[PDB]
PDB file of C-alpha atoms in Angstrom:
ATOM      1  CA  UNK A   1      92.164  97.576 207.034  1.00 56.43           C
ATOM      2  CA  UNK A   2      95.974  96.756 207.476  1.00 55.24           C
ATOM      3  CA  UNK A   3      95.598  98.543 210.707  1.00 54.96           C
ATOM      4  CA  UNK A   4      92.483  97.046 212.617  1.00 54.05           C
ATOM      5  CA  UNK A   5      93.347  93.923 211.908  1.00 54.97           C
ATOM      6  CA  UNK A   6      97.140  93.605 213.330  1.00 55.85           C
ATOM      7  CA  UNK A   7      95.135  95.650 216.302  1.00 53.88           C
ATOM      8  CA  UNK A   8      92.793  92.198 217.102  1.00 55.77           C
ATOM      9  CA  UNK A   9      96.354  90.186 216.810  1.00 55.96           C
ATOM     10  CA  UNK A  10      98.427  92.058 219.016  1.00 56.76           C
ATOM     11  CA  UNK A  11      95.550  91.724 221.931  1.00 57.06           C
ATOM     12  CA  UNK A  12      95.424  88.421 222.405  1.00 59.28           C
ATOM     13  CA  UNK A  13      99.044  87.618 221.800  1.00 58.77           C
ATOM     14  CA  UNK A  14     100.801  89.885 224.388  1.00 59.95           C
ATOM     15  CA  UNK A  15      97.858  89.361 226.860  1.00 58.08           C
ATOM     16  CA  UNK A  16      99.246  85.521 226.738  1.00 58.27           C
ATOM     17  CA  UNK A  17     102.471  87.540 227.553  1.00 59.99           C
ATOM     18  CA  UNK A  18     101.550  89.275 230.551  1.00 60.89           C
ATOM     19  CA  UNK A  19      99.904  86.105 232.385  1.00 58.28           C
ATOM     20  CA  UNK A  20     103.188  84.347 231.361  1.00 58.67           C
ATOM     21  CA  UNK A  21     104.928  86.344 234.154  1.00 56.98           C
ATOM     22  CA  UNK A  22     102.111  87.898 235.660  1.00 57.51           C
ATOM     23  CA  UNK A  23     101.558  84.777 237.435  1.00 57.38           C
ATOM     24  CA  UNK A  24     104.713  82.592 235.782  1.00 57.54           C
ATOM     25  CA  UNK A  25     102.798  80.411 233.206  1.00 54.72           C
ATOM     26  CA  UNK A  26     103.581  79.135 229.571  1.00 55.05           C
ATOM     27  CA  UNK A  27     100.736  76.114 229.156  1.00 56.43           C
ATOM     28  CA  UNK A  28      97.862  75.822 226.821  1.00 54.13           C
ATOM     29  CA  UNK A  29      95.496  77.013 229.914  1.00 50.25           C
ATOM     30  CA  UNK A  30      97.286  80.682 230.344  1.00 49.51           C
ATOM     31  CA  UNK A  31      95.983  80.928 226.437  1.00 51.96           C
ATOM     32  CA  UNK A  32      92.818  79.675 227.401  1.00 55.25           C
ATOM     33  CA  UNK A  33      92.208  81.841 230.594  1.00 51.84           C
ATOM     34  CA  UNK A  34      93.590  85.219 228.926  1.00 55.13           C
ATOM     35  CA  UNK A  35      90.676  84.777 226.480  1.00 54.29           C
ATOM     36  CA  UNK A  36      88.453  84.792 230.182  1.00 54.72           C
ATOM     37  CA  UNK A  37      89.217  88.444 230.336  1.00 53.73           C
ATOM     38  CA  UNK A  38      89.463  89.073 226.296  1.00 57.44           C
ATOM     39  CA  UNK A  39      86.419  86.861 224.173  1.00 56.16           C
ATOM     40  CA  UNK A  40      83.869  89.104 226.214  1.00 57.55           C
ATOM     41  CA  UNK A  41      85.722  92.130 224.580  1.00 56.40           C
ATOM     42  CA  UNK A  42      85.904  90.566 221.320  1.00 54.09           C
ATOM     43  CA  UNK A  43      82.366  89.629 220.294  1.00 52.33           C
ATOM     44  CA  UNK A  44      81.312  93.186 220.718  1.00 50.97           C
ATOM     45  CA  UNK A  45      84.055  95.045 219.247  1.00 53.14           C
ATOM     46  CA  UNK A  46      82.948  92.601 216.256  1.00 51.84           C
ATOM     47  CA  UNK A  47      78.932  93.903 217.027  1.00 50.44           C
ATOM     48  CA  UNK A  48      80.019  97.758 216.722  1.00 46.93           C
ATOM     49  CA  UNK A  49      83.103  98.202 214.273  1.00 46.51           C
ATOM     50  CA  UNK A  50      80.078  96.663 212.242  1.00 46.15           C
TER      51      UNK A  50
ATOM     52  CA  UNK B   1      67.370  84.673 231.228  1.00 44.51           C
ATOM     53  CA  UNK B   2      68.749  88.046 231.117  1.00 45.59           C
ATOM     54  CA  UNK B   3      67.412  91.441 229.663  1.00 48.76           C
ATOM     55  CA  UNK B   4      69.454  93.912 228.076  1.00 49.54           C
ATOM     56  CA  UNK B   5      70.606  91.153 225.555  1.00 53.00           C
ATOM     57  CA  UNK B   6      67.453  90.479 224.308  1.00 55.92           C
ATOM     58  CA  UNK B   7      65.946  93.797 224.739  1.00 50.90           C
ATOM     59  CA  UNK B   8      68.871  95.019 221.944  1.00 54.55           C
ATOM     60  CA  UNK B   9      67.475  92.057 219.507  1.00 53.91           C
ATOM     61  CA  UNK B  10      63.988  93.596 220.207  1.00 52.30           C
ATOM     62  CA  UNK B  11      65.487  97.308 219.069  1.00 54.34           C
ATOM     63  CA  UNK B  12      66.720  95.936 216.444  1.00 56.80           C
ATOM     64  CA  UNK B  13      62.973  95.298 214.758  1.00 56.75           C
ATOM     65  CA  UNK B  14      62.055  98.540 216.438  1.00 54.14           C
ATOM     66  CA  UNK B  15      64.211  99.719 213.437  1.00 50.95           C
ATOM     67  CA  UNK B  16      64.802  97.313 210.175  1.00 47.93           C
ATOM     68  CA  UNK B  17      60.775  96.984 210.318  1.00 49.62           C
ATOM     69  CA  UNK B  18      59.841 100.242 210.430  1.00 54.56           C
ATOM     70  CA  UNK B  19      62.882 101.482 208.072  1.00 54.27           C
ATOM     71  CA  UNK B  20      61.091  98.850 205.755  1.00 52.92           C
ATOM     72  CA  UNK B  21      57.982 101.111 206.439  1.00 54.36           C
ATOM     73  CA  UNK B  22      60.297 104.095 204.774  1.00 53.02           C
ATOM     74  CA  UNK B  23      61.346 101.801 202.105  1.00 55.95           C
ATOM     75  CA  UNK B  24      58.596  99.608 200.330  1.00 55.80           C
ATOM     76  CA  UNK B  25      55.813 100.239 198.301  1.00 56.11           C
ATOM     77  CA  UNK B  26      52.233 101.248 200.087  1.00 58.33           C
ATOM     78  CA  UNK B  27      50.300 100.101 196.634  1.00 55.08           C
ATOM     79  CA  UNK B  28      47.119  98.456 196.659  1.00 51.16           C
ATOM     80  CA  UNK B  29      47.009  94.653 195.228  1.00 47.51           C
ATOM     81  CA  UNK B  30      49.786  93.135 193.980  1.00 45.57           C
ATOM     82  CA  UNK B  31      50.490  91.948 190.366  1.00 45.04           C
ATOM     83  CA  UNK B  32      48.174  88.755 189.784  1.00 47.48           C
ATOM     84  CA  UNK B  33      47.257  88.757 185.911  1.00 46.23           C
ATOM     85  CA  UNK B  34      49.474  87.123 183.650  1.00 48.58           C
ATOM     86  CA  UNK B  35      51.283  89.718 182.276  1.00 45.24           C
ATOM     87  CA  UNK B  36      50.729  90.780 178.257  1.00 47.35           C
ATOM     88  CA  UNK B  37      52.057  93.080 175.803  1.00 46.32           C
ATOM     89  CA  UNK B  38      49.665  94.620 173.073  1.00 46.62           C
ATOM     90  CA  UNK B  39      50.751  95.770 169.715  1.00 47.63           C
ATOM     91  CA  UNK B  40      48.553  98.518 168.170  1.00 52.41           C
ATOM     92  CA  UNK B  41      48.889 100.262 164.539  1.00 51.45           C
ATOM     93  CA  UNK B  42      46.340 102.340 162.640  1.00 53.44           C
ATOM     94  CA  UNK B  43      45.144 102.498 158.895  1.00 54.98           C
ATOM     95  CA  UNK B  44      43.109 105.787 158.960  1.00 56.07           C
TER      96      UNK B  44
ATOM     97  CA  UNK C   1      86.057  92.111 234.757  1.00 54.56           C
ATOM     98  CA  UNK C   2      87.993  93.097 238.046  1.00 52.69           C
ATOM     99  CA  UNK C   3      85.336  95.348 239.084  1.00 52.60           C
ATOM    100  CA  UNK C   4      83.161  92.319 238.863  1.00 54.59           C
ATOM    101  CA  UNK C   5      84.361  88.662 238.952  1.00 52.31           C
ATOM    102  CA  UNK C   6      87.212  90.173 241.175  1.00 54.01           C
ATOM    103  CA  UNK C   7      87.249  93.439 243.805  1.00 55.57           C
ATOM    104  CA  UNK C   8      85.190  96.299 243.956  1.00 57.40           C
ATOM    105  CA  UNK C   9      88.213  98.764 243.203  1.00 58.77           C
ATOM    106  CA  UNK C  10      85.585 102.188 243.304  1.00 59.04           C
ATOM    107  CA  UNK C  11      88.897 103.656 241.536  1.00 57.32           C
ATOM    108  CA  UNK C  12      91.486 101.023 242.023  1.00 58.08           C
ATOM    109  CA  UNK C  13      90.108  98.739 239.435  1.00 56.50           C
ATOM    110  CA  UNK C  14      89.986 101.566 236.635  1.00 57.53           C
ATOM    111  CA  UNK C  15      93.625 102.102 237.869  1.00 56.50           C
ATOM    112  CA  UNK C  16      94.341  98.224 238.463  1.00 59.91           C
ATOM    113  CA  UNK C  17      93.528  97.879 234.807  1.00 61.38           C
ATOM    114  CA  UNK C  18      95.543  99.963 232.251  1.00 62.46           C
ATOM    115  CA  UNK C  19      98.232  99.327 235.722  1.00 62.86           C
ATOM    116  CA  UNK C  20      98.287  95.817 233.517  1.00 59.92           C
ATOM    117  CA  UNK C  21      97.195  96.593 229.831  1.00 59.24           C
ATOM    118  CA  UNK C  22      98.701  99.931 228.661  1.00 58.47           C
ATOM    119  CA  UNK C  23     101.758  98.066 226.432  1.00 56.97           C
ATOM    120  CA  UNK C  24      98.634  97.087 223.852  1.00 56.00           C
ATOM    121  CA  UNK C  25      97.563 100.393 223.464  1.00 54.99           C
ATOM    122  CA  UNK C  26     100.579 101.660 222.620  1.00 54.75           C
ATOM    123  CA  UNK C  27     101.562  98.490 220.723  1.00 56.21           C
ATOM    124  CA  UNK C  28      98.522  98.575 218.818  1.00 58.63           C
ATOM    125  CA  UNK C  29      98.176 102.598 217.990  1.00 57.56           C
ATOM    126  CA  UNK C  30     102.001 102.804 217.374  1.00 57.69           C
ATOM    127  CA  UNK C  31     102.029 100.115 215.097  1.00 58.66           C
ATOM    128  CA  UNK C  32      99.195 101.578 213.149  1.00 58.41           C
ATOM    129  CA  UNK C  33     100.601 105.332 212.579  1.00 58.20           C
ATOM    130  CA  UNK C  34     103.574 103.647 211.205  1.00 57.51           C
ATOM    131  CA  UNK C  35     101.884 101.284 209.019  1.00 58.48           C
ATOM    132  CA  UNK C  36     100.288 104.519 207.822  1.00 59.72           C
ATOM    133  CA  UNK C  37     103.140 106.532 207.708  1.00 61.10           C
ATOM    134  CA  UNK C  38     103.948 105.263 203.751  1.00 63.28           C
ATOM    135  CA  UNK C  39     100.606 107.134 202.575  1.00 63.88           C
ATOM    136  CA  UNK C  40     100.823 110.221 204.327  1.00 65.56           C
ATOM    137  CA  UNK C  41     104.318 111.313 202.554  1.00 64.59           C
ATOM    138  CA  UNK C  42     106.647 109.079 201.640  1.00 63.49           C
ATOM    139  CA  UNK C  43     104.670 108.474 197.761  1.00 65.44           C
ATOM    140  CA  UNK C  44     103.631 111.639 196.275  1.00 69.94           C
ATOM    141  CA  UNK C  45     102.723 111.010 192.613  1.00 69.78           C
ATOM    142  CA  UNK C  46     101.516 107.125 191.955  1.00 72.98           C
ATOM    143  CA  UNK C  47      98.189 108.218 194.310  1.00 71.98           C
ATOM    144  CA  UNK C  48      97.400 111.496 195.740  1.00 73.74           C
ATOM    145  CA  UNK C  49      94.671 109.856 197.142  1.00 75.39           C
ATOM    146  CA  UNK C  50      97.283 108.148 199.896  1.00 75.77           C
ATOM    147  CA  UNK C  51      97.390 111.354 201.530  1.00 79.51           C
ATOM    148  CA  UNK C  52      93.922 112.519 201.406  1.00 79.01           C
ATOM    149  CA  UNK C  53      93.685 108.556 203.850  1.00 78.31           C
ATOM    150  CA  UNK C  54      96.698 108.730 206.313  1.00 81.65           C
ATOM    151  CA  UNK C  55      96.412 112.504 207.198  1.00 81.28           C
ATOM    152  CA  UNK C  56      93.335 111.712 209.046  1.00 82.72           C
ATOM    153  CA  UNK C  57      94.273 108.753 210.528  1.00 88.22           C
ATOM    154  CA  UNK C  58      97.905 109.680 212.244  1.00 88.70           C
ATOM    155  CA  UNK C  59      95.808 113.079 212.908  1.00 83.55           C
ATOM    156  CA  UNK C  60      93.053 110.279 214.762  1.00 82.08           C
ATOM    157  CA  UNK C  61      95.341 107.746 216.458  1.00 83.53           C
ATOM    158  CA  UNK C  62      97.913 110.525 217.631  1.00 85.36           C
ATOM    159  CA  UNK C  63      95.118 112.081 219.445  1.00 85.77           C
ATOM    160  CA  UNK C  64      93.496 108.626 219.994  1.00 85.29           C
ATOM    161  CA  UNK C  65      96.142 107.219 223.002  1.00 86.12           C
ATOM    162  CA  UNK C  66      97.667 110.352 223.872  1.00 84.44           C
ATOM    163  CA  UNK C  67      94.570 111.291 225.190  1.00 81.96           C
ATOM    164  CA  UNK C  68      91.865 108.218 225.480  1.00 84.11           C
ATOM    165  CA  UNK C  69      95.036 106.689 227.216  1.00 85.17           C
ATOM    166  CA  UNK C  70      95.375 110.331 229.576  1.00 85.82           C
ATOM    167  CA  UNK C  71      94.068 113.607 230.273  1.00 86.42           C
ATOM    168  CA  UNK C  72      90.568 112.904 228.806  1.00 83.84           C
ATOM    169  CA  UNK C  73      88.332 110.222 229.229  1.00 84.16           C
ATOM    170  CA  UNK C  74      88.772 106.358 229.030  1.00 83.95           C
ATOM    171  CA  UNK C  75      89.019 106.366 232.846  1.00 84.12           C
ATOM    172  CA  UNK C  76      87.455 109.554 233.763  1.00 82.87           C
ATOM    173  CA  UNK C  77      84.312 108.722 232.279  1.00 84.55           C
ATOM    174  CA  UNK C  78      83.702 105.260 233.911  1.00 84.82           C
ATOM    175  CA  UNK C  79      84.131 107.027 237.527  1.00 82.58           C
ATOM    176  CA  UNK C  80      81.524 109.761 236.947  1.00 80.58           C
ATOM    177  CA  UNK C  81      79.339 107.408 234.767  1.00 80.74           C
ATOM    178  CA  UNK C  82      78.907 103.548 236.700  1.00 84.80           C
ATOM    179  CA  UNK C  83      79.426 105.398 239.727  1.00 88.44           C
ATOM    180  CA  UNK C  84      78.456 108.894 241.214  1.00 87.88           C
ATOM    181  CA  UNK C  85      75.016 107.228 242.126  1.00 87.28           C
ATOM    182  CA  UNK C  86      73.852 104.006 240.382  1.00 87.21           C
TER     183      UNK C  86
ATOM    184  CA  UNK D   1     118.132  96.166 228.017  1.00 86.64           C
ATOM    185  CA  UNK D   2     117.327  99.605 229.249  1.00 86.27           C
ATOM    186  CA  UNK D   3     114.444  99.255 226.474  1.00 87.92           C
ATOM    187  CA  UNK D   4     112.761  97.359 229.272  1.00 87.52           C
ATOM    188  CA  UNK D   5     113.557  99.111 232.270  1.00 91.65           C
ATOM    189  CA  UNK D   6     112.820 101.711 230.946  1.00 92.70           C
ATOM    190  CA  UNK D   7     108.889 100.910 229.721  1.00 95.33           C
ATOM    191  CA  UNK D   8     108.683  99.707 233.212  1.00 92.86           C
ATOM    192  CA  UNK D   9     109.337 103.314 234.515  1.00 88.82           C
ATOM    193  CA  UNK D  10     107.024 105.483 232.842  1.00 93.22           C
ATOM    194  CA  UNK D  11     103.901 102.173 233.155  1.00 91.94           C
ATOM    195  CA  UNK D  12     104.226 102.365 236.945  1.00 93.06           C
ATOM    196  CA  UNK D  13     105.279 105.851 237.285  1.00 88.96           C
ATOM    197  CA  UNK D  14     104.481 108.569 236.168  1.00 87.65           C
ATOM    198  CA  UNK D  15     101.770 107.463 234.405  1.00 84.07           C
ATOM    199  CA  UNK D  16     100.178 105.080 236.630  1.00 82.07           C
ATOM    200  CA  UNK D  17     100.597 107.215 239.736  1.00 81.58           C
ATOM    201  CA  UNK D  18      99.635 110.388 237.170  1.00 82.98           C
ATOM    202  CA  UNK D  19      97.004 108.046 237.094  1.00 82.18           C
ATOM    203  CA  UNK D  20      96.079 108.142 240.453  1.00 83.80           C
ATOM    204  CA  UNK D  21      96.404 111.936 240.070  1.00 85.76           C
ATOM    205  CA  UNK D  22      93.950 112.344 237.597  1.00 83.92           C
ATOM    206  CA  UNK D  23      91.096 110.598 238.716  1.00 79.60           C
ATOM    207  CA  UNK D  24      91.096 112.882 242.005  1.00 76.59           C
ATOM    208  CA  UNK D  25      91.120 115.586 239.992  1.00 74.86           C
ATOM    209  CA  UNK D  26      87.857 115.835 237.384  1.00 78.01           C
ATOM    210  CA  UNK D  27      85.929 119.240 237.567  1.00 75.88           C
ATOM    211  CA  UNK D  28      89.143 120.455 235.620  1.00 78.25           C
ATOM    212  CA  UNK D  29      89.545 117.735 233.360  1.00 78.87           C
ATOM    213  CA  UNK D  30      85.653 117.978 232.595  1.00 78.77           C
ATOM    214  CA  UNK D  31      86.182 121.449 231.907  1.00 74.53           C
ATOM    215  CA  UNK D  32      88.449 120.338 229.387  1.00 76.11           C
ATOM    216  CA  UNK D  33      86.909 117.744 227.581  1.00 72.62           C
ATOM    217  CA  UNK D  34      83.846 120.432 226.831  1.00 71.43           C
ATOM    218  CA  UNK D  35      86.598 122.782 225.572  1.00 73.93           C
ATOM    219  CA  UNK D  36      87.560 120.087 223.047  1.00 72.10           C
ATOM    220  CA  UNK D  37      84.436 119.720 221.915  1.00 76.19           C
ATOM    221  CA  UNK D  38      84.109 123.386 221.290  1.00 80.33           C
TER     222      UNK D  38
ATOM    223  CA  UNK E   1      61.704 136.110 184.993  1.00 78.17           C
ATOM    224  CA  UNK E   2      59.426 136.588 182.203  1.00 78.70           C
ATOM    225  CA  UNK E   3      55.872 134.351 181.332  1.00 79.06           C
ATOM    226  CA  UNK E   4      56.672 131.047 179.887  1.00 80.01           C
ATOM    227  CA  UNK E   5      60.071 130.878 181.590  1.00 78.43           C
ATOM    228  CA  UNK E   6      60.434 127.589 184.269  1.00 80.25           C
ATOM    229  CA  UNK E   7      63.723 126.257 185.346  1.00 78.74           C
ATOM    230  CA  UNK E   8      64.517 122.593 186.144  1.00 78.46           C
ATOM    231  CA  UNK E   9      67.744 121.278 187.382  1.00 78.32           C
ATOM    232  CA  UNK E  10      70.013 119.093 184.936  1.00 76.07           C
ATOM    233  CA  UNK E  11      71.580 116.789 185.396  1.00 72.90           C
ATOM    234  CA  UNK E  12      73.990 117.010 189.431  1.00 71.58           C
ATOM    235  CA  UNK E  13      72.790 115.298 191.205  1.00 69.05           C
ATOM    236  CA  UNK E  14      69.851 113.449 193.575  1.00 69.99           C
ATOM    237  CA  UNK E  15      71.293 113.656 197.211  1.00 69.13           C
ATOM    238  CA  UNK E  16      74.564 114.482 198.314  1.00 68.34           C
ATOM    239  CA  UNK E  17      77.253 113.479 200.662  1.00 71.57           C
ATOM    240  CA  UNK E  18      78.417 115.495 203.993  1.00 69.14           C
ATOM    241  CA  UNK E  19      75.734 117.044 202.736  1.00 67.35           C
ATOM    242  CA  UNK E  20      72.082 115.283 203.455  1.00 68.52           C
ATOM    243  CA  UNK E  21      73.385 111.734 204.032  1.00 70.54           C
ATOM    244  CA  UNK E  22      76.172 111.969 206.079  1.00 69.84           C
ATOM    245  CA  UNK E  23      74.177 112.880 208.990  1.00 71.45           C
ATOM    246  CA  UNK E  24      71.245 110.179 208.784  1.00 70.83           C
ATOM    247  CA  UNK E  25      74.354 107.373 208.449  1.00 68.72           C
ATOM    248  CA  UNK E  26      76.277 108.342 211.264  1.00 70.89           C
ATOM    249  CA  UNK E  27      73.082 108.958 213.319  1.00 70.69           C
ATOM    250  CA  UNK E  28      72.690 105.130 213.494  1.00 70.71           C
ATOM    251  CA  UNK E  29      76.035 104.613 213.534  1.00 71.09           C
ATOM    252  CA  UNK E  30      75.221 105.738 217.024  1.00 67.75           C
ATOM    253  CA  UNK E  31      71.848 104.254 217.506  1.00 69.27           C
ATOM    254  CA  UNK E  32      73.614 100.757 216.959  1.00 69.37           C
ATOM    255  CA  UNK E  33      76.740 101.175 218.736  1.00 65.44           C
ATOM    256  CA  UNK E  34      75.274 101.845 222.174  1.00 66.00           C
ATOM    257  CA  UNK E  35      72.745  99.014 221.380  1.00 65.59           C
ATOM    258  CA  UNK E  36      75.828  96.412 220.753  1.00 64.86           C
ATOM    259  CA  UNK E  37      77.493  97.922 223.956  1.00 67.37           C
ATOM    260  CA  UNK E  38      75.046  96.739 226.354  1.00 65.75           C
ATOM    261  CA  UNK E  39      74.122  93.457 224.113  1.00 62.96           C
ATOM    262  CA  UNK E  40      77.525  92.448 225.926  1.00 64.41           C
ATOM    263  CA  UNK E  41      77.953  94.391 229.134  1.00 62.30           C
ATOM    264  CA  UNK E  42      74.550  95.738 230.943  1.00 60.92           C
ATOM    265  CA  UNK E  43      74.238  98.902 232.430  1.00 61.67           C
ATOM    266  CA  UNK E  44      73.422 102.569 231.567  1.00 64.61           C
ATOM    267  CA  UNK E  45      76.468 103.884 232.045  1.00 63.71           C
ATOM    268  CA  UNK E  46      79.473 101.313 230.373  1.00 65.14           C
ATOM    269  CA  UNK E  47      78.366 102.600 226.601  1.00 65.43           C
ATOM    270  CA  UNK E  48      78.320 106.609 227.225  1.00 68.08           C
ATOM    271  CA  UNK E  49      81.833 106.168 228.087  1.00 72.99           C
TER     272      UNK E  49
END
């Protein structure tokens, strides 16, 4: 488990990371904007890991 | 709305159903009577 | 999502994309070998059964980036498969 | 920190342009992913 | 063998495990997994790869 698990928390942490220099950008809406691009992915990784 | 999404739901009873189909019994009736026990000896 | 939302990119979306995501990959899959790493060796009498695990896991992730990340598909496959024809 | 630099390197490199490489390549690489499944 | 001589097999096993099984389990492991990759992304090509 251990391992897909830290997996699902390292994606949306460091993908705040890159749009915090990407395009300069600390706030609460970089966070909510990288998870544009990454709750699509999530949902269905969820739907087939199953 | 849109298809695909759907259409997966929809596959989804094109299995479970029919794996049911694989995996319950075909038999007749059901039970119905009350069910009973019956004891039974023998003096010859 | 570039492809999309964004530009066409025929091959310079596939590119645009791991051109700003490969550090997760590598984050990810590098993390896990070494979170494996204790089973694998390491302990060698409590369970045996920690080897039978983490042999075929560092033998799956190894070959699971340098690889899905390269060479062979992940990339490759998108090109011939969304495009080519329809 | 080099550390930095350096991850910077091989990303837009080197890999990236490797990258670029690849894809125009792909009868080979095919060829190769066929031979893995063997 | 001789008359009056059957076999029957004690008693190991009903259905094994890379044997039998293994197959019909990872055969909708499939049948799933291409499903769920389209329940989120539409195409015919995004779940091959």
């Amino acid at each position: 488990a251990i391992g897909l698990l830290v997996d699902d928390a390292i994606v949306v942490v460091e993908n705040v990371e890159r749009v915090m220099a990407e395009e300069g950008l600390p706030p609460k809406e970089a966070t909510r904007k990288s998870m544009g691009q990454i709750q699509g992915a999530l949902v269905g990784i969820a739907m087939v890991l199953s | 709305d849109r298809p695909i999404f759907a259409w997966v739901i929809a596959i989804i009873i094109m299995l479970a159903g029919g794996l049911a189909i694989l995996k319950l019994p075909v038999a007749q009736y059901p039970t119905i009577a009350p069910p009973a026990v019956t004891i039974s000896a023998s003096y010859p | 999502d570039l492809m999309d939302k964004e530009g066409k990119g025929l091959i310079e979306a596939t590119l645009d994309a791991v051109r700003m995501r490969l550090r997760p990959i590598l984050m990810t899959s590098l993390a896990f070998i070494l979170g494996v790493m204790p089973l694998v060796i390491s302990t060698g009498a409590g369970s045996g059964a920690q080897n039978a695990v983490g042999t075929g896991v560092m033998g799956g992730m190894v070959t699971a980036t340098v690889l899905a990340i390269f060479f062979v598909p992940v990339f490759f496959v998108v090109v011939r498969r969304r495009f080519s024809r329809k | 920190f080099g550390w930095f630099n350096r991850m910077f390197e091989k990303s837009t490199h080197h890999y990236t342009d490797s990258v670029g490489g690849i894809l125009r390549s792909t009868g080979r690489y095919l060829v190769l992913y066929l031979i893995i499944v063997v | 063998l001789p008359t009056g001589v059957g076999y029957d097999w004690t008693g190991s096993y009903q259905e094994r495990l890379s044997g039998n099984q293994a197959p019909s389990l990872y055969a909708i492991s499939l049948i799933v997994v291409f499903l769920c990759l389209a329940a989120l992304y539409e195409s015919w090509s995004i779940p091959f790869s």
